[PDB]
Design a binder for this molecule. Structure first.
Ligand code: CLA
Ligand code: CLA
Ligand code: CLA
Ligand code: CLA
Ligand code: CLA
Ligand code: CLA
Ligand code: CLA
Ligand code: CLA
Ligand SMILES: CCCCCCCCCCCCCCCC(=O)OC[C@H](COP(=O)(O)OC[C@@H](O)CO)OC(=O)CCCCCCCCCCCCCCC
Ligand SMILES: CC1=C(/C=C/C(C)=C/C=C/C(C)=C/C=C/C=C(C)/C=C/C=C(C)/C=C/C2=C(C)CCCC2(C)C)C(C)(C)CCC1
Ligand code: SF4
Ligand code: SF4
Ligand code: SF4
Lengths: 40, 80, 74, 743, 132, 160, 62, 73
């Protein structure tokens, strides 16, 4: 477990997870609040 | 042909003279360093300009500097 | 149309040459001692600042200009 | 005891996640830790170079076997996904009912951000991206009929993927074979040539004879897919098969007896293409695989194993020596049984060469139902396999050079063929250089001559079919030979192997599937250009292999390695003198070569083959036959091909083909981006980085992993990578978009 | 005393006959196969061996290989067209990597690389900063 | 209006674009039928299109002759939603990221292995440091006036 | 003062570690031209972490 | 016109960066602190210290020419 957590703490892995999360939240925002070119 | 100069920062590691592909460098007696030896360039007429020597120097800045210059058959490595 | 493109291209070559000879000057004719704390020497003292900031400007302009174009394309 | 035995070590490597948390464990140097950004890049570049990670062939060998299982697992997952996507996200059922109208589609995009436009109205009450891999045609030939079957094959794929992954772990961590096991070429060839290929073909023939053939006959006749009996029904009720093929009634009795003629119903040598589907008759394909199976199984009994009879490859190789070749093929056996790189070289070159052959043979002799009329799929497959082939061929050369620098031993190679080759390398390279110049000057000169003449208003002085003409007489002759073969040199055949050589126009759905392809002056000119491109590629690559260890310029290149940046600024300059660099340059020429080939295919077909034919004999080709008088000049290619056939991509915005337009542009960008890595040097970049780092330091922060510029070699690699991606990507979109429209 | 070799197209050319030529000599205790810089494999003789090359680097490269065979008695010479010969390596009998009393320093500057003169100072002189 | 532009609510070109766009989708839907999954999708798409145009119409966006919205960024607060307000968002988020990053680097710099903690991040510490960036504006100013942000010529420089 | 384990700032303009801090390892007392041996925590463009400097090129930092 | 003008700005700035850097880093750098002793144009300084290709000032002119053409284009 400890060792696996270290692998999951490696730079490449963390970047992918973080970017996936970031991408996801951006996509989700556009799904519910779509087509915005300004704050209204 | 090319010009090779050695500076006082040499430490007599002998690495440069062991890397020259054409025996241009030698290790001569000296007292400025603990090793008691310094490098010399007695036969620069055979330098091809490889700069392998510089790549081997351990000093902060190369104690052995090769300045490329006039070119001859020997310096241009022409077997023909 | 020809005249405009002609002079603009010549202008570019002339501009690049100026900077080129400016560099030749530093390597060949610059006397560090004569120009002590001169306006010219101080330029070479904050060289990193100039280069770094010019880099940032280029990056800012590059990212956003290209980004906006691609947004419009998509 | 037995010459061939199984030796395996139990529990060789413990399974744990410790090493996973220690990046760079494989290397002694990298293991120490990161001090500069170079460490990161080196980690990824030395990951699969087992030879440098260990000094024992056994260990290297063990890793390779397991790694291969991993690739197989990935491949299985890939195939599984395709079948699943064809079961849940496709219009196969509708297409199956009306193959001519409905368009194949197996990918659907989520309705996010207007990307839905990409979901086209393919047909069959379905909206999705039109795929071009040819899955639907293959499935029809197999006799899938339902989408339930596709689901099950998908499940099988997932299961198989898992089994392979387990095998990899098992044969590396629990039961690792020893070197003696690996070094059994005769046994391996016997097994692979009789079991993998022979039994494989026989098994496939069984499926084709008992399941595919019957179902496809019913489909072609007109029976609705739902009305066709399930596959198992055919296997059980012999009477049903007898109705379709009236020989199954006799059973296997004819086979055990010598009367193989009775099976002429399903085993045939018809030749040509099925008029209804526009594909090769499955009966012929069944006989094909059956015949090949017998051949392979027999061939698998040629090498000695443990029963005395057979051949020993070493003896065969050593016996073949002559007056002009010294010791002959002595020493080769040891090389190929003690060097993985050497084996990869030969194997990789042959694999790539096969792909190129597949591309040619698969368009002239369409193998699947309803494939020829689908111009998009045809173009996609030809180009795809042409590329895969080029890369593999260049790769073979690369690994060949790695052998010379890492595994070649002068002692084991005295006066053998290899030694003698390296002893007259100057002659070989000198002559090839001339051949390349000759071909290049004459071949390309023809085009330049024509351009000048047409521009100067002197069309009568051009090398054209209407002026000075350069006809491909030899090829024209072979075509006639092949056309008249059926009934003469091939008495039992009924039609030409391909209608390309000659024959009638096969049309399916009002569209031309195949037609005689004629060869004239333009064809002569282009074919010779292909020769030039290939020859130059060989020059660069061969020079790299022959001069890998030494040269007059750098006598000790071997010690420097296979991938060194240079030897220095001396000797007038020694930049890019490694064998790696020769491969680097070779890839650029391979790109050029393949690009021209695929363009030839695209224009020739759209001009002299593809098109529509009326109920009466009126053939209208897509481009109108412009190839003859326009492909003889460079301006013609730029105007009548690139400029005209690119009207689709550039005008794709607002349509389901918009993606191709965006990718076309994106690829151009990446191609240009690469030119900055290919023209610049590490020095400028390193100095720039210094100034940037100054800023970070001025604010009291800077990375301990000191930022450094990419190595000389990496710079070149990054440049080549982006260059290739951009160029190939651009054509990819261009072709696909154009094809969708023409189809 | 030539080693056993079957010939190659990578040997010497006219320069060796009209400008200058090189030759290496060594002694072996066994007949073994070595790789020659020109390209190919050859078998050395049990005793004295002589080989001709076109470049000094080619000769010194072979010497490196010889050291692997534990041969350290190699000698390199340059033969001019008229027949004059110059002994080149080991020049003083002692390999250059080993300090030998009696060798004088050459091309040595007694200061750090950063103490060289400024280019402008030596303008219109003909000398370079590193030679100044 | 500013620059001779017209409000999109009062631009005929804008409306023409809307009608045309919807028509295209509707024409496509005609081929499919009733509750066919394809038709329902196209129908939903037209709703989104109508909504988008409506939103822009109710906005203060100014359209040009082409009937396309043009943004204003001269500093006027009348059109702050177009650039100023969104701009603050970027600055806040970007500063947050930069500040937290610098903090972590400086924090792990004094560790047993300062380079291992850059390739294998200490997630627990990182998360703590990341949360403390919401007040980056205040912290930064405080660090500047404390002479702890900008260094003082004790950094490596080029030979000249 | 330059002495074993002392920390100093390099004053050689040609050094990769100019205006940086290093720890004096040992100072030779035999009259060699560059007696002090300073060690740094950062590798140079060549990958070295040590160099020998003269006492004048080093200023004690504390 | 707004966008194209900002693109032209990018060109001028990037071309200038290359040229200005070349001028300032012509008498020396961290990679080659003794550049002034080699001149305005030299091939390189060897495959060592990481690789020193295109490190001379002349190379800045070489690299800037491409950008100049792009911007003028
Ligand atoms: C359009 C660009 C272009 C052109 C024309 C060439 C041309 C050539 N390359 Mg090349 N190359 C290029 C781009 C190009 N390269 C790029 C981008 C790369 C980077 C990967 C390379 C990398 C590369 C390598 C690595 C190699 C070549 C080689 C060759 C030569 C092949 C021999 C040959 O056909 O001679 C004929 C050359 C022609 C240009 C034919 C046209 C000339 C006319 C039509 C023929 C008659 C003219 C007559 C001789 C004189 C007329 C007189 C009057 C005009 C003054 C040839 C000189 C190979 C080589 O040198 O081996 C021989 C080789 O090994 N190239
Ligand atoms: C008044 C203008 C002017 C003057 C007097 C000089 C003078 C000088 N420059 Mg300079 N320069 C200028 C403008 C000028 N330059 C401009 C505008 C640029 C920007 C491009 C440069 C860029 C530049 C560089 C980068 C360098 C110089 C150098 C030099 C010095 C040597 C020149 C040399 O060796 O050329 C000798 C003669 C030639 C090079 C012949 C030129 C042949 C050209 C390149 C090819 C011709 C084009 C082609 C053939 C057209 C055919 C096409 C056809 C097929 C259609 C000399 C002091 C060099 C130096 O070291 O000085 C210290 C140097 O390195 N200059
Ligand atoms: C298409 C070709 C191409 C492109 C795109 C670039 C791009 C660049 N070059 Mg360049 N160059 C090229 C060809 C090209 N070059 C060629 C052929 C040469 C030979 C002369 C050079 C020679 C050269 C020199 C000598 C220098 C540059 C520099 C630069 C940079 C300038 C700063 C900039 O624009 O930042 C913006 C960069 C980009 C927009 C390009 C990358 C874009 C990617 C896709 C990121 C996009 C992000 C996007 C906006 C969204 C981000 C958020 C997302 C993560 C969610 C930039 C990376 C300069 C430099 O180092 O910069 C300071 C510099 O000194 N180049
Ligand atoms: C060659 C393999 C392959 C490829 C390229 C695709 C591609 C696609 N599939 Mg598909 N599929 C495949 C195999 C494949 N499939 C197989 C074998 C099955 C059977 C299980 C399926 C079952 C399937 C379904 C059921 C669906 C798809 C869908 C899709 C599409 C959306 C993909 C998606 O989820 O995006 C979004 C991606 C995600 C949601 C995944 C999240 C991203 C993760 C978290 C990043 C990875 C984390 C990283 C690895 C961490 C590393 C940790 C370390 C231990 C390694 C996309 C075109 C969807 C679709 O088309 O809908 C219309 C859909 O519904 N596929
Ligand atoms: C969960 C099961 C498991 C565990 C704990 C280990 C643990 C270990 N294996 Mg092992 N292995 C396994 C399964 C496992 N293996 C399987 C299934 C195979 C067959 C493919 C192998 C094949 C294998 C080989 C050939 C080697 C190891 C080695 C090692 C050791 C070093 C770890 C390492 O290199 O990091 C690797 C960590 C990674 C994250 C690499 C994953 C790369 C992925 C799979 C690429 C594909 C991703 C994607 C699909 C492609 C791009 C998109 C370590 C003891 C090495 C060793 O030390 O031997 C002495 C070694 O040489 N293993
Ligand atoms: C008749 C026996 C037999 C068969 C079928 C194979 C088949 C194969 N060997 Mg192989 N091998 C054999 C004997 C055999 N070997 C022997 C005796 C030796 C020792 C001398 C080796 C040593 C050896 C090495 C060293 C390597 C192989 C590799 C391979 C694979 C090559 C890749 C390929 O074509 O993918 C085709 C892929 C498939 C067809 C997928 C199915 C694969 C499974 C394992 C087939 C097993 C039979 C299957 C269950 C059908 C049963 C019939 C039943 C339904 C009625 C292939 C699966 C290479 C490899 O990649 O291995 C991982 C490799 O590196 N073999
Ligand atoms: C059967 C196929 C095969 C196999 C098993 C190998 C195996 C090997 N090759 Mg080899 N090679 C092959 C095919 C193959 N090659 C082909 C076809 C070529 C020609 C291009 C080469 C060219 C080649 C060179 C030039 C070199 C090797 C080297 C190596 C060795 C180390 C590989 C390495 O560094 O891993 C690490 C692997 C990688 C870093 C690859 C990662 C993938 C990169 C990033 C490209 C990804 C492109 C991607 C598809 C694009 C996606 C676009 C998207 C992002 C939009 C290893 C023995 C190297 C060596 O030292 O040998 C001893 C070496 O120098 N090979
Ligand atoms: C050099 C270009 C430039 C710059 C830097 C600015 C900067 C600014 N303008 Mg501005 N402006 C410019 C050109 C420029 N303007 C031009 C050319 C026009 C005429 C079209 C305007 C018309 C304008 C208006 C009408 C207003 C600003 C306002 C503002 C300020 C934004 C409010 C704030 O607190 O921040 C800011 C100082 C606002 C302001 O002063 O808020 C108090 C404001 O109401 N500007
Ligand atoms: C090609 C004709 C041919 O095959 O000749 C073959 C010729 C004679 O081969 P041998 O019979 O003497 O040697 C037999 C062994 O190589 C095994 O076949 O070999 C050469 O010398 C080729 C010379 C370079 C090829 C010139 C181009
Ligand atoms: C009247 C008027 C106006 C104007 C204003 C102004 C005042 C402007 C300015 C402008 C300017 C003000 C510009 C400038 C420019 C500059 C430049 C363009 C520069 C360049 C430089 C260089 C190129 C350098 C060089 C060099 C080097 C590199 C180093 C040293 C040496 C030398 C010097 C050689 C306005 C708008 C219209 C409007 C109102 C009125
Ligand atoms: S440059 Fe090459 S030949 Fe000259 S001294 Fe250095 S190593 Fe010897
Ligand atoms: S490598 Fe450098 S320090 Fe060592 S002996 Fe040669 S010149 Fe002196
Ligand atoms: S740095 Fe570049 S130019 Fe200099 S020797 Fe190495 S490869 Fe040649």
């Amino acid at each position: 477990m400890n060792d696996f957590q270290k692998y999951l703490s490696t730079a490449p892995v963390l970047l992918t997870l973080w970017m996936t999360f970031t991408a996801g939240f951006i996509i989700e925002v556009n799904r519910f609040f779509p087509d915005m070119l300004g704050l209204y | 042909s090319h010009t090779v100069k050695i500076y006082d920062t040499c430490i007599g590691c002998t690495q440069c003279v062991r890397a020259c592909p054409t025996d241009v460098l030698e290790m001569v007696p000296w007292d400025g360093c603990k090793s008691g030896q310094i490098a010399s360039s007695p036969r620069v007429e055979d330098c091809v300009g490889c700069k392998r020597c510089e790549t081997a120097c351990p000093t902060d800045f190369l104690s052995v500097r090769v300045y490329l210059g006039a070119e001859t058959t020997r310096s241009l490595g022409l077997a023909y | 149309a020809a005249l405009y493109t002609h002079h603009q291209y010549i202008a570019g070559f002339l501009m690049v040459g100026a900077f080129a000879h400016g560099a030749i000057f530093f390597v060949r004719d610059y006397d560090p001692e004569l120009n002590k704390n001169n306006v010219l020497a101080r330029m070479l003292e904050h060289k990193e600042a100039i280069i770094s900031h010019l880099s940032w400007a280029s990056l800012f302009l590059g990212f956003h200009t290209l980004g906006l174009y691609i947004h419009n394309d998509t | 005891s037995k010459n061939v035995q199984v030796f395996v070590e139990k529990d060789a490597v413990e399974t744990s996640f410790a090493k996973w948390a220690q990046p760079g464990h494989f290397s002694r140097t990298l293991a120490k830790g990161p001090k500069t950004t170079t460490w990161i890049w080196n980690l990824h570049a030395d990951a699969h170079d087992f030879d440098s990670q260990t000094s024992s062939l056994e260990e290297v060998s063990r890793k390779i076997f397991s790694a291969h299982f991993g690739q197989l697992a990935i491949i299985f997952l890939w195939i599984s996904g395709m079948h699943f996507h064809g079961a849940y996200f496709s219009n196969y059922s509708a297409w199956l009912t009306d193959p001519i109208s409905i368009k194949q589609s197996s990918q659907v995009v989520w309705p996010i951000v207007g990307q839905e436009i990409l979901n086209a109205d393919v047909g069959g009450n379905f909206q999705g991206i039109q795929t071009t891999s040819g899955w639907f045609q293959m499935w029809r030939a197999e006799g899938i009929t339902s989408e339930v079957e596709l689901y099950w094959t998908a499940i099988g794929g997932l299961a198989m993927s898992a089994i392979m992954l387990f095998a990899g772990w098992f044969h590396y961590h629990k039961a690792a074979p020893k070197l003696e096991w690996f070094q059994n070429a005769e046994s391996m060839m016997n097994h692979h040539l009789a079991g993998l290929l022979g039994l494989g073909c026989l098994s496939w023939s069984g499926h084709q004879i008992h399941i595919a053939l019957p179902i496809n006959k019913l489909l072609d006749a007109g029976v609705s897919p739902q009305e066709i009996p399930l596959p198992h029904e055919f296997l059980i009720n012999r009477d049903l098969m007898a109705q379709l093929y009236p020989s199954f009634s006799k059973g296997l009795a004819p086979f055990f007896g010598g009367n193989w003629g009775e099976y002429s119903d399903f085993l045939t040598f018809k030749g040509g293409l099925n008029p209804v589907t526009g594909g090769l008759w499955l009966s012929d394909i069944a006989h094909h695989h059956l015949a090949l199976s017998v051949l392979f199984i027999i061939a698998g009994h040629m090498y000695r194993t443990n029963w005395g009879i057979g051949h020993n490859m070493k003896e065969i190789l050593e016996a073949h020596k002559g007056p002009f070749t010294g010791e002959g093929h002595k020493g080769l056996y040891e090389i190929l049984t003690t060097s993985w790189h050497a084996q990869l070289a030969i194997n990789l070159a042959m694999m790539g060469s096969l792909s190129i052959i597949v591309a040619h043979h698969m368009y002239a002799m369409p193998p699947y139902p309803y494939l020829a009329t689908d111009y998009a799929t045809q173009l996609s497959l030809f180009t795809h396999h042409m590329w895969i082939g080029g890369f593999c061929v260049v790769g073979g050369a690369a690994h060949g050079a790695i052998f010379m620098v890492r595994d070649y031993t002068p002692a084991n190679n005295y006066n053998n063929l290899l030694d003698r080759v390296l002893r007259h390398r100057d002659a070989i390279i000198s002559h090839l250089n001339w051949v390349c110049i000759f071909l290049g000057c004459h071949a390309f000169g023809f085009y330049i001559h024509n351009d000048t003449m047409r521009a100067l208003g002197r069309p009568q002085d051009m090398f054209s079919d209407k002026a000075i003409q350069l006809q491909p007489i030899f090829a024209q002759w072979i075509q006639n030979i092949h056309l008249l073969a059926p009934g003469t040199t091939a008495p039992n055949a009924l039609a030409t192997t391909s209608y390309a050589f000659g024959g009638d126009v096969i049309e399916v759905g009002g569209k031309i599937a195949m037609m005689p392809i004629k060869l004239g002056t333009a064809d002569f000119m282009v074919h010779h250009i292909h020769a030039f491109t290939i020859h130059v590629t060989v020059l660069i690559l061969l020079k790299g292999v022959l001069y890998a260890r030494s040269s007059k310029l750098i006598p000790d290149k071997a010690n420097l390695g296979f991938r060194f940046p240079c030897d220095g600024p001396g000797r007038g300059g020694t930049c890019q003198s490694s064998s790696w660099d020769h491969v680097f340059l070779g890839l650029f020429w391979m790109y050029n070569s393949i690009s021209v080939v695929i363009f030839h295919f695209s224009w020739k077909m759209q001009s002299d083959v593809w098109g529509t034919i009326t109920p009466d004999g009126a053939i209208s080709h897509i481009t109108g036959g412009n190839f003859a008088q326009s492909s003889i000049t460079i301006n013609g290619w730029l105007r009548d091909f690139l400029w005209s056939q690119a009207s689709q991509v550039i005008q794709s915005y607002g349509s389901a083909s918009s993606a191709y337009g965006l990718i076309f542009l994106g690829a151009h960008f990446i191609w240009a981006f690469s030119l900055m890595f290919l023209f610049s040097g590490r020095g400028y970049w390193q100095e720039l980085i210094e100034s940037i780092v100054w800023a970070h330091n001025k604010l009291n922060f800077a990375p301990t992993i000191q930022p450094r510029a990419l190595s000389i070699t990496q710079g070149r690699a990054v440049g080549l990578a982006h260059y290739l991606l951009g160029g190939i990507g651009t054509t990819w979109a261009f072709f696909l978009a154009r094809a969708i429209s023409i189809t | 005393p030539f080693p056993t070799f079957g010939g190659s197209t990578g040997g010497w050319l006219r320069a060796a006959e009209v400008e200058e030529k090189y030759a290496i000599t060594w002694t072996s205790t066994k007949e073994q196969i070595f790789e020659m810089p020109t390209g190919g494999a050859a078998i050395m003789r049990n005793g004295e061996n002589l080989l001709y090359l076109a470049r000094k680097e080619q000769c010194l490269a072979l010497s490196t290989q010889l050291r692997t065979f534990k041969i350290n008695d190699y000698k390199i010479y340059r033969i001019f067209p008229s027949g004059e010969v110059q002994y080149l390596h080991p020049k003083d009998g002692v390999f250059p990597e080993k300090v030998n009393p009696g060798r004088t320093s050459v091309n040595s500057r007694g200061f750090s690389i950063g103490k060289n003169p400024n280019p402008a100072s030596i303008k219109f002189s003909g000398i370079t900063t590193y030679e100044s | 209006e500013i620059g001779g532009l017209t409000k999109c609510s009062e631009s005929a070109a804008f409306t023409k674009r809307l009608n045309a766009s919807v028509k295209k989708l509707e024409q496509r839907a005609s081929q499919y039928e009733a509750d066919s999954p394809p038709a329902l999708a196209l129908k939903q798409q037209v709703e989104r299109t109508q909504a988008r145009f409506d939103k822009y119409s109710r906005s203060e966006l100014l359209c040009g002759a082409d009937g396309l919205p043009h943004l204003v960024a001269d500093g006027r607060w009348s059109h702050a939603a177009e650039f100023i307000l969104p701009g603050f968002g970027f600055i806040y988020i970007s500063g947050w990221i930069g500040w937290v990053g610098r903090k972590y680097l400086r924090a792990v710099s004094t560790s047993a292995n300062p380079s291992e903690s850059e390739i294998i991040i200490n997630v627990p510490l990182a998360l703590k440091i990341m949360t403390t960036g919401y007040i980056w504006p205040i912290s930064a100013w405080q660090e500047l006036i404390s002479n702890d942000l900008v260094a003082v010529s004790e950094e490596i420089t080029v030979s000249p | 003062m330059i002495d074993r384990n002392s920390k100093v700032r390099i004053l050689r303009k040609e050094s990769y570690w100019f205006n940086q801090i290093g720890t004096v390892a040992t100072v030779d007392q035999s009259g060699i031209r560059y007696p002090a041996v300073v060690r740094f925590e950062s590798v140079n463009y060549a990958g070295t972490n040590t160099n020998n400097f003269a006492l004048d090129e080093l200023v004690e930092v504390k | 016109d707004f966008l194209v003008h900002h693109a032209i700005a990018l060109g001028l700035h990037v071309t200038a960066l290359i040229l200005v850097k070349g001028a300032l880093d012509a008498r020396g750098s961290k990679l080659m602190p003794d550049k002034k002793d080699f001149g305005y144009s030299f091939p390189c300084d060897g495959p060592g210290r990481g690789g020193t290709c295109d490190i001379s000032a002349w190379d800045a002119f070489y690299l800037a020419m491409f950008w100049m053409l792009n911007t003028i284009g």
